[PDB]
């Protein structure tokens, strides 16, 4: 790695392969679920993971975790998706937004409702 | 854009006086100044250096009333100047118009003084001004507009100012309710509880 080697070959740098390819820098994308399904983990861990196969406007079909506590989705349900990766899910790099575009407004939540679209309940 | 909750909770949180009430009474008479607010406010937590830094920043903010974003502006400008940054930071913090009025004892609490500025009661160098964050220059002469020179609050605050230490850099005349910002106050001219070096350290994270 001497200078005379740099002049004959400058230092390179590998590109930043986007962990969220199906977004193409779009902060969100609209999509239609082409399948709905849940998956339990191995014998030791018992849990249910909500997730949909969804075709995007760009043409990609991906997997997006269903935020949970709102489940009104089925084949041909449009939905807006954002790039969020949950641990314990192998291919889920996207989270369905909760609170817009054909997603049920979750039942009343007194805390952190904005992250679910629940409006401030007017007592 | 101004904090409007209870006052003493801050002092009880920052564990010291902040001159948030007129001062006719002692703090303990009005609160548990020795103990933090809230259910768990009695127990003494094991904080961190970072916690120290934050807690000192929130102090000087709260003792002056600058919100966050407006504050670091003062800092980000204070660092740009010459001399000891954290030093001159306080210096310009001592330059806020309201604070000067408060220092001049026209207002018991700074908020009370701030309300005066906001309520168009003070003229710097003969001309009216109503922005509280209006910086001031040496030799400037603030004053009271006659529409308020007869206000009950201004005379009572003047009767409360001499109960506290007469500032040096700025000189007042309570006779006609107008004073002179002669000199830019120095670091020593302020208190000593303030640790400006850690205030810089915080934003320098």
């Amino acid at each position: 790695a001497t200078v005379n080697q740099l002049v004959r070959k400058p230092r390179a740098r590998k590109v930043a392969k986007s962990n969220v390819p199906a977004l193409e820098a779009c902060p969100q994308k609209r999509g239609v679920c082409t399948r709905v399904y849940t998956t339990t983990p191995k014998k030791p861990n018992s849990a249910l993971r909500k997730v949909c196969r969804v075709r995007l406007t760009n043409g990609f079909e991906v997997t997006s975790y269903i935020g949970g506590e709102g489940h009104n989705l089925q084949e041909h349900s449009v939905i807006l998706i954002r790039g969020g990766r949950v641990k314990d899910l192998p291919g889920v790099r996207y989270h369905t937004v909760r609170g817009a575009l054909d997603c049920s407004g979750v039942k009343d939540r007194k805390q952190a409702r904005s992250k679910y679209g629940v409006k401030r309940p007017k007592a | 854009a101004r904090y409007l909750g209870p006052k003493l909770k801050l002092s009880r949180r920052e564990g010291t006086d902040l001159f948030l009430k007129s001062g006719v009474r002692a703090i303990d008479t009005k609160c548990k100044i020795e103990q933090a607010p809230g259910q768990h406010g009695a127990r003494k937590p094991r904080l961190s250096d970072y916690g120290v830094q934050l807690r000192e920043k929130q102090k000087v903010r709260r003792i002056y009333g600058v919100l966050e974003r407006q504050f670091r502006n003062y800092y980000k400008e204070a660092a740009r100047l010459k001399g000891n940054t954290g030093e001159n930071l306080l210096a310009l913090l001592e330059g806020r118009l309201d604070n000067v009025v408060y220092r001049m004892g026209f207002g018991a609490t700074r908020a009370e003084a701030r309300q005066l500025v906001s309520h168009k009661a003070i003229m710097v160098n003969g001309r009216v001004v109503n922005i509280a964050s209006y910086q001031v220059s040496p030799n400037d002469v603030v004053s009271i507009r006659e529409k308020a020179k007869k206000q009950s609050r201004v005379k009572a605050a003047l009767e409360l100012a001499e109960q506290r230490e007469k500032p040096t850099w700025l000189e007042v005349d309570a006779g006609k309710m107008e004073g002179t910002f002669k000199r830019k106050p120095e670091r020593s001219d302020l208190s000593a509880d303030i640790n400006e070096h850690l205030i810089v350290e915080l934003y320098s994270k």
Partner: protein
């Protein structure tokens, strides 16, 4: 072959049947991940939440009567736009839609083609590939999917 998929079918069919739900395809994949995928058919509709209901009940009957001793992973699924058809009856229900299929044999001239169903028989399914009404034995088909196209 069939990893005693017969028992898998009965074990899943019972709770699913109890749910008033119809069962369509059972598939298990070992090695890559011992995960089982189930295709269900609810006429009213199939939300994920219901898939959770059946996932719990089937998990329950699966737990006691499971002697395969593979890793315990299995997902519940509802037919995708591209949905596999396993029964002759399934071919019958999709009278006139495109279905892709691949022959089990990898010999040359294998039926790796898609067609549109014209007629449905038990052993033989008529699908139109290259303008020809071909008939296929479903047992000799490795895997087949219907209408991968979204309209």
């Amino acid at each position: 072959m069939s990893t005693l998929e017969q028992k898998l079918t009965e074990m899943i069919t019972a709770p699913v049947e109890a749910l008033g739900f119809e069962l369509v395809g059972i598939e298990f994949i070992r090695g890559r991940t011992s995960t089982l995928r189930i295709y269900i058919d609810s006429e009213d509709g199939i939300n994920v939440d219901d898939c959770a209901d059946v996932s719990h009940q089937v998990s329950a009957v699966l737990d006691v009567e499971d002697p395969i001793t593979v890793a315990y992973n299995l997902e519940v699924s509802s037919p995708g736009l591209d949905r596999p058809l396993f029964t002759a009856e399934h071919y019958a229900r999709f009278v006139g839609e495109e279905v892709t299929l691949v022959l089990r044999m990898a010999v040359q001239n294998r039926r790796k083609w898609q067609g549109v169903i014209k007629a449905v028989d038990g052993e033989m399914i008529t699908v139109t590939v290259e303008g020809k009404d071909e008939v296929f034995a479903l047992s000799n088909i490795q895997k087949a999917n219907l209408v991968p196209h979204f309209a």
